């Protein structure tokens, strides 16, 4: 499946794509304002994610550091990134279907839209100005908005036991971005697409 990744922000981002223990395609690439990067992802990829990293520096060997979304100091990511990160999440060809969503469970750094480019389902969007409106205790000095699990580490925020509910902090994300997951056991906003769809992820989808 092809994913076209488009940077519509006014700043450079470093796109990253991984399934947790391996890179998807080249795993990572710089995208200046306006650039697109098409990648190919193996069918049957379960638990893939794509996200953006901000304010990065890499040397010639491709090692360095990012202010948000850092995946162990590498340009070409193999693991998931350090919160806060808005996440495009997907599982392909799962008993005939594709499953996509956007999650704020690890916070928010960049607004995003995640849509199929082929026929037969709708896309999702989390384009609100979450960073500007963040509650004081969740603001990341590093840039971006942390989720409450990262900041406080309690069973209730992390849904450690499998029995958590909504909280003052999860309700903040949900009010700004109703179509994204705001906590683990949130009522699903996953979209079901035909198996083998293609996709576009756009950073900063609106002016």
UniProtKB/Swiss-Prot annotation:
InterPro entries named in the record: Osmotin/thaumatin-like_sf (IPR037176), Thaumatin (IPR001938), Thaumatin_CS (IPR017949)
Protein keywords: Cytoplasmic vesicle, Disulfide bond, Signal, Taste-modifying protein
Gene Ontology CC entries for this record: cytoplasmic vesicle
Pfam families: Thaumatin
Keyword field contains Signal: yes
Gene3D superfamilies, per database record: Thaumatin
Lineage top rank: taxon: Eukaryota
Cellular localisation: Cytoplasmic vesicle
Similarity remark: Belongs to the thaumatin family.
Task performed by this protein: Taste-modifying protein; intensely sweet-tasting. It is 100000 times sweeter than sucrose on a molar basis.
Name of the protein in question: Thaumatin I
Organism: Thaumatococcus daniellii (Katemfe)
